[PDB]
Design a protein around this ligand. Structure first.
Ligand SMILES: *[C@@H]1O[C@H](CO)[C@@H](O)[C@H](O)[C@H]1NC(C)=O
Ligand SMILES: *[C@@H]1O[C@H](CO)[C@@H](O)[C@H](O)[C@H]1NC(C)=O
Ligand SMILES: *[C@@H]1O[C@H](CO)[C@@H](O)[C@H](O)[C@H]1NC(C)=O
Ligand SMILES: *[C@@H]1O[C@H](CO)[C@@H](O)[C@H](O)[C@H]1NC(C)=O
Ligand SMILES: *[C@](C)(O)CCC[N+](C)(C)C
Ligand SMILES: *[C@](C)(O)CCC[N+](C)(C)C
Ligand SMILES: C[C@H](O)CCC[N+](C)(C)C
Ligand SMILES: C[C@H](O)CCC[N+](C)(C)C
Ligand SMILES: [Cl-]
Ligand SMILES: [Cl-]
Ligand SMILES: [Cl-]
Ligand SMILES: [Cl-]
Lengths: 532, 528
């Protein structure tokens, strides 16, 4: 019985799911931790205790409690990222797709959804793992972790709300794959962890954290890295926000114990409703509760760890999308609209930069402005719009990732960098937004392979080669297949710093992805803000 | 006689000179002040006392005492700027070229040579005023003024060496023209002063000085403005440098009188020998003795004066050359040579910027570096060379002039801006230096009009339209006669290229870099 598997915690019963004229096995909603409810809220996850009988694993599980986006009701472009299942604090489950017949000991890929650490689900349609697992014959795992206050509230010192529990939820799911995936036909010695945005930052954090290192073989980071400005906060800022949350709910602030006890008596939706009120300034691409540099999950500052090579040394494949910042400008910056060309006046441009670099002083602001302003034509609405898009994307995603890739490669054993710049022919978002943050995921999971989705033939071929790059990399540590005729994705080296564009046109090799801007963001601006 | 003129100080006998198969009158070496020698060194100029008899004005006068460039002996490119006659402290004279027959109340143009305030002569071949005076039929005057310590040693408080005497010398020459040009066929009410580099900065300073304003009608500034970073120092820096001069010569530094008396006993060449030893940093495009903001010649800071509109309001015609910085990189920056392409390594680039912005801190240097480095190819020697070239030109000439043009236009009565970017065909300097600082002068003075100089027919035509723009402007306030050189406005900020090709109108001359040098950097250095 392919569907009846017995794990270390009890038996589980999957289901036969159809896929591209064929079929595969699916195990949906398998628990890997105890429900972090009641007195468990904010606390480190605990291993799921053994159960008797057969666990029905044929339906998706609940999604964690989170802020839901209602900016555009009925609009698929945004609602495809919202929970598609009932939310509940009892959400620590994982899904698995296994080729049929069951492989013996094949490659395993574990997906970690993104969503700024304040949202995300393992059950979205865009994350349906059946297409990838089937086409590349890999065992695909989809995990989950607590988001928002529930997974990242941090009061350093306390053991009730220590912080980073969401990262620990992820670790426990990987520990489960390590101990049980063999029963599903996967080789636990060859597991690749891959994620996008907050997911990509997570993958990068496991690479740095000593406690996660032995739980996976290789890693793929898509549009996200550990050192991003939004991916973490100090213990001090974490406490400030934690104490600010209590104040917003008239909580007793006399002690961590009383504060935490107060926050535990509250209903999920009560914490969520005030979540954004704890932020330092008016801003965009900034999230209230994220990982904290505690000295535990993270030994020392992320920067010193990268400079000293204190991290798992292996092969990594990572990259970014052409327009990482448009999605966030649309939601929180003046002048942007989904139903318009969004030409930004000079006044709105200024407001946007302030919004994008909230931590900067007046001098740092002038520096940013000058760096992205064409003074021969400053009132050009289009240049001002695209300018802000580049600012937001470079500061928050692209440049932090380049910093990471350059630091990593000095110690790693094989780096591959990509630049995704293909605008899907069926995108429901406006043309000015370009290649949007997160829209490369549908190609990674093979959505283009299904006819009724209406992707072009060239997009299907692109999807097929991207999945092949990902899987092959997962299996061997090299996205290329030896002695093959197709163009080769070259290694990224400290010297030549090569990378390829990922699109429907023949491969192109480039060098130094946005070096000019990243020098500004990674070297110059910090020195400037550090002055006084 | 057409050559014998009676001025308010005495008679002068000129000389009939040949010019382009014709002739004109020339009155060379006319004294406009008393010889500033002996106890008069460092002191304000005093008017030339009347003389009996006829003053022989047939030959050029002596040039003032100055540092002489001996970097390239025999090489015409550098020597054409050196004194072409005996140097002496008694050097306050002027030259005049009058068309023949003597016109009536015609337009007058007064030339003020450049040279960083440490050098220059009115007698240089390239400043021969006969071609311009004849061709455009104007009375051309070229004056002289003390340079170096002799003309700019500043010891605010003292009246034996108060500072700015070189500018005061220029003022006395203009005053002299104001009272005597009429006797030469010139119109004292229609005088245009023009000069290059330090000469351009001087013109700008007269526009700002209350005591100079009534001495001229219009102004032309070529590659220089009063606000350039090298054109002036504070009273404190002036005194510090002055005292360091004494120290270098082992002078009594107990008081100003003692210091001055000591410095007045030294031979001219002794001072000149240690002149460069008083600069505060290792640098380029920086000079020891320059004008000082004393509160007298200059009421308040140049900036506050520019913002409040406290200055002469008239028409101005100013501009710059395409490669203002190459000449100074060649003399003081590592990696540069006259006999090679001069590809600049990365290390030399870094050395260069530090040399170019001596006052900036490390953050400021990184700012300049990032602003001029193409990181997709930083080890490119040609790009590093051109970057340093632009750095020196933008910081010292182009951007300070643009800041001036924008401030002046808000209160002025007409601005005309130009960008000179034509490379002379007979230039003796290497190609990497491009359109060099000061080489537009030869075009302004009509040198291309003489065959023996081997210029191209296209360049001669260029020289003719430049001389006509300059002259027509001087006489009406508009370079165009009734392609038109558009007026520069606060709104459109238009300017024209000046070359052998049909005119082209542009807008915002190097606005990107000048926003960096006029707004960002200043603010950054003040904050850190
Ligand atoms: C498992 O759940 C699915 C979906 O409701 C159902 O079809 C199936 O019969 C269940 N299996 C059992 C017997 O629990
Ligand atoms: C990875 O490590 C192996 C063994 O240490 C070495 O042979 C190989 O060259 C390395 N690969 C890269 C690209 O660093
Ligand atoms: C004026 O001086 C020149 C040069 O010394 C001399 O040739 C000329 O004869 C003098 N003028 C006269 C004729 O007195
Ligand atoms: C110059 O001033 C006159 C008289 O005030 C004025 O009529 C004219 O418009 C001004 N010209 C310019 C270009 O400012
Ligand atoms: C990243 C900040 O985690 C953002 C991911 C957001 N979606 C919309 C692509 C899921
Ligand atoms: C200006 C700094 O006064 C420099 C003038 C240089 N020459 C060589 C053109 C005289
Ligand atoms: C990234 C995102 O759309 C933020 C959610 C909107 N606010 C901050 C207004 C609640
Ligand atoms: C351009 C010029 O001759 C610079 C002056 C050179 N030193 C300092 C050596 C005297
Ligand atoms: Cl970088
Ligand atoms: Cl001749
Ligand atoms: Cl001589
Ligand atoms: Cl105007």
């Amino acid at each position: 019985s392919e569907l009846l598997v017995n794990t270390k915690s009890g038996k589980v019963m999957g289901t036969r799911v159809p896929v591209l004229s064929s079929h595969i096995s699916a195990f949906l909603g398998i628990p890997f931790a105890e429900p972090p409810v009641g007195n468990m809220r904010f606390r480190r996850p605990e291993p799921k205790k053994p159960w008797s009988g057969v666990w029905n694993a044929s339906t998706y599980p609940n999604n964690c409690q989170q802020y839901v986006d209602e900016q555009f009701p009925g609009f698929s472009g945004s609602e495809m990222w919202n929970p598609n299942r009932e939310m509940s604090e009892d959400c620590l489950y994982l899904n698995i797709w296994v080729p049929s017949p069951r492989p013996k000991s094949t490659t395993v890929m574990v997906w970690i959804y993104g969503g700024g650490f304040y949202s995300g689900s393992s059950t979205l349609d865009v994350y349906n793992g059946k297409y990838l697992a089937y086409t590349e014959e890999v065992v695909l795992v989809s995990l989950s972790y607590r988001v928002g206050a529930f997974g990242f509230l941090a009061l350093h010192g306390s053991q009730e709300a220590p912080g980073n529990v969401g990262l620990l939820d992820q670790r426990m799911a990987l520990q489960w794959v390590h101990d049980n995936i063999q029963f599903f036909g996967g080789d636990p010695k060859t597991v690749t962890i891959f994620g996008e945005s907050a997911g990509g930052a997570s993958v990068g954090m496991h690479i740095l954290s000593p406690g996660s290192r032995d739980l996976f073989r290789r890693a793929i980071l898509q549009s996200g890295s550990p050192n991003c400005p939004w991916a973490s906060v100090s213990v001090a800022e974490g406490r400030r926000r934690a104490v600010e949350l209590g104040r917003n709910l008239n909580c007793n602030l006399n002690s961590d114990e009383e504060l935490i006890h107060c926050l535990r008596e509250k209903k999920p939706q009560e914490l969520i409703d005030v979540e954004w009120n704890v932020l330092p300034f008016d801003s965009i691409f900034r999230f209230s509760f994220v990982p904290v540099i505690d000295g535990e999950f993270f030994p020392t500052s992320l920067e010193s760890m990268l400079n000293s090579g204190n991290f798992k040394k292996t092969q990594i494949l990572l990259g970014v999308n052409k327009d990482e910042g448009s999605f966030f400008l649309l939601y929180g910056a003046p002048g942007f609209s989904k139903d318009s060309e969004s030409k930004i006046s000079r006044e709105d441009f200024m407001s946007g930069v302030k919004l994008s670099v909230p931590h900067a002083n007046d001098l740092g602001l002038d520096a940013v402005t000058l760096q992205y302003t064409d003074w021969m034509d400053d009132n050009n609405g289009i240049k001002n719009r695209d300018g802000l898009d580049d600012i937001v994307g470079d500061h928050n995603v692209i440049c932090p990732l380049m910093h990471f890739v350059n630091k990593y490669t000095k110690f790693g054993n094989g780096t591959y960098l990509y630049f995704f710049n293909h605008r899907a022919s069926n995108l429901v978002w406006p043309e000015w937004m370009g290649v949007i943050h997160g829209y490369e995921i549908e190609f990674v999971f093979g959505l283009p392979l299904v006819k009724e989705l209406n992707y072009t033939a060239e997009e299907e071929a692109l999807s097929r080669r991207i999945m092949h790059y990902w899987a092959t990399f997962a299996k061997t540590g090299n996205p290329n297949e030896p002695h093959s005729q197709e163009s080769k994705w070259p290694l990224f080296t400290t010297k030549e710093q090569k990378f390829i564009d990922l699109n429907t046109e023949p491969m192109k090799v480039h060098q130094r992805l946005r070096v000019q801007m990243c020098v500004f963001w990674n070297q110059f601006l910090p020195k400037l803000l550090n002055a006084t």
